[PDB]
Amino acid sequence: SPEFPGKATGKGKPVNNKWLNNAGKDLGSPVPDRIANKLRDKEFKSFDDFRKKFWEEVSKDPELSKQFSRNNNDRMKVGKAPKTRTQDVSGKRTSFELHHEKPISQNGGVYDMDNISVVTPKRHIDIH
Ligand SMILES: [Cl-]
Ligand SMILES: [Zn+2]
């Protein structure tokens, strides 16, 4: 179902300068409220379309962008996830991933930003 369109909803959460520090534990990091404000009520053709726009908006956020290296900003500018610490990769999965907290399977919203978290590839697996 992430291969089909819909409209982003949700509020996201307040975040600070240590956004993504805990993406490798628990249920990961929330969608920042500031980013949710940019994406809410917009239409997306696919979840990949959403993910690209999500990271693009991160790169344009003055608070979030300064938490990342120039190359990671360059990735996010074109919709690519920033790279994780080396210790948090799994195989060829080397950049942060988006996770649905209530699974798509159980009617968790695909584009519900209050159902989406940011996780390391390593942590993502464990939740699955
Ligand atoms: Cl809502
Ligand atoms: Zn997941």
Resolution in A: 1.7
Distance 3 CA to ligand 2 centre (A): 15
* Domain edges within the chain: 1-128
| 83 vs 112: CA distance, rounded Å | 24
- Name the closest ligand to CA 113: 1
Q: Do the beta carbons of residue 33 and residue 12 sit within 8 Å?
A: yes
- Is 100 annotated for ligand binding? no
Q: Which fold has domain 1-128?
A: 3.90.540
Provide DSSP, 80-94.
PPPBPPGGG-BTTB-
Token digits for 103?
Answer: 């699974």
Helices (H) and strands (E) in the chain, counts: 5, 5
C-alpha torsion sign, points 31, 105, 9, 45: positive
- The stretches of the chain forming alpha helices (DSSP H) are 33-39, 47-59, 62-65, 70-77, 121-127
Query: Which positions ≥6 away from 15 have C-beta within 8 Å?
Result: 29, 30, 32, 33, 34, 64
Nearest of 34, 41, 89 to residue 58 by alpha carbon:
34
Distance 42 CA to ligand 1 centre (A): 12
Breaks in the chain after (C-N > 2.5 angstroms): none
Query: Which positions ≥6 away from 49 have C-beta within 8 Å?
Result: none
